[PDB]
Amino acid sequence: ASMTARPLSELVERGWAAALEPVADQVAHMGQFLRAEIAAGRRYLPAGSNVLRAFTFPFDNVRVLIVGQDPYPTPGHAVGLSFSVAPDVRPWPRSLANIFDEYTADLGYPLPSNGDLTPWAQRGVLLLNRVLTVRPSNPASHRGKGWEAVTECAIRALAARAAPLVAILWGRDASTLKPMLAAGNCVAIESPHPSPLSASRGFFGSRPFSRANELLVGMGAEPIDWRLP
Numbered sequence: 652a653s654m655t656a657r658p659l660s661e662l663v664e665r666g667w668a669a670a671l672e673p674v675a676d677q678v679a680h681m682g683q684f685l686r687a688e689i690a691a692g693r694r695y696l697p698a699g700s701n702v703l704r705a706f707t708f709p710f711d712n713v714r715v716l717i718v719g720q721d722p723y724p725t726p727g728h729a730v731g732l733s734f735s736v737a738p739d740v741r742p743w744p745r746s747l748a749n750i751f752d753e754y755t756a757d758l759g760y761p762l763p764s765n766g767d768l769t770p771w772a773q774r775g776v777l778l779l780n781r782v783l784t785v786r787p788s789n790p791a792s793h794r795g796k797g798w799e800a801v802t803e804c805a806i807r808a809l810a811a812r813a814a815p816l817v818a819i820l821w822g823r824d825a826s827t828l829k830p831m832l833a834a835g836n837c838v839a840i841e842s843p844h845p846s847p848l849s850a851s852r853g854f855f856g857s858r859p860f861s862r863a864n865e866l867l868v869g870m871g872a873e874p875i876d877w878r879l880p
């Protein structure tokens with residue numbers, strides 16, 4: 652399960668292993684980066700086994716991509732699926748409480764029971780971050796350390812599939828993927844990030860879930876069942 656030691660055919664789902672072939676060396680380089688962080692006395696999140704978790708759901712099944720910045724910086728929050736937390740986590744991270752506030756306003760569903768977004772992943776929503784690791788307590792600490800090439804390759808591969816795609820890009824780092832979504836089978840929703848620092852600039856009221864479903868149906872795709880327990 653180590654990115655430095657084992658090839659993509661072992662680490663990620665078959666479709667993803669082929670999609671990410673251009674960045675195979677880059678993923679191994681990120682394994683070396685995290686080895687060097689530990690050797691230097693710094694930690695990272697999420698756990699090594701969860702870093703590539705978004706790519707363990709089938710490539711061919713992705714209909715919607717949600718992109719954030721980087722993983723939760725608090726130990727015990729990040730699980731390798733962007734914005735998701737383990738079902739026993741409480742209180743919810745503030746960004747996730749803001750996502751669920753907009754989920755209820757948009758869809759009219761009750762507040763979810765917990766912060767586990769695996770139902771979305773299991774229904775063709777890719778829960779990605781622009782950067783896939785962070786140092787504990789230090790948001791954006793791994794920006795510019797080599798993940799951007801990996802997530803760029805992930806978007807370009809999705810966008811090249813003979814399939815509709817809708818992208819929801821939360822915040823400025825996620826927005827740097829907008830150029831790779833130019834093709835006519837792809838459409839991108841962009842808003843400020845749901846973080847308390849940015850949410851009041853346009854995340855609240857952005858209705859991303861109903862918009863993504865109108866877009867999927869407009870391209871002849873099935874809408875996402877967003878409903879969480």
Ligand SMILES: O=c1[nH]cc(O)c(=O)[nH]1
Binds near residue numbers: 720721733735846
């Ligand atoms: O997974 C994530 N957790 C927290 C965020 O701010 C983010 O952009 N993504």
Ligand SMILES: [Cl-]
Binds near residue numbers: 695
């Ligand atoms: Cl640390």
Ligand SMILES: [Cl-]
Binds near residue numbers: 772775
């Ligand atoms: Cl998925």
Ligand SMILES: [Cl-]
Binds near residue numbers: 865866869
């Ligand atoms: Cl439409």
Ligand code: NA
Binds near residue numbers: 709772774775777
């Ligand atoms: Na999927």
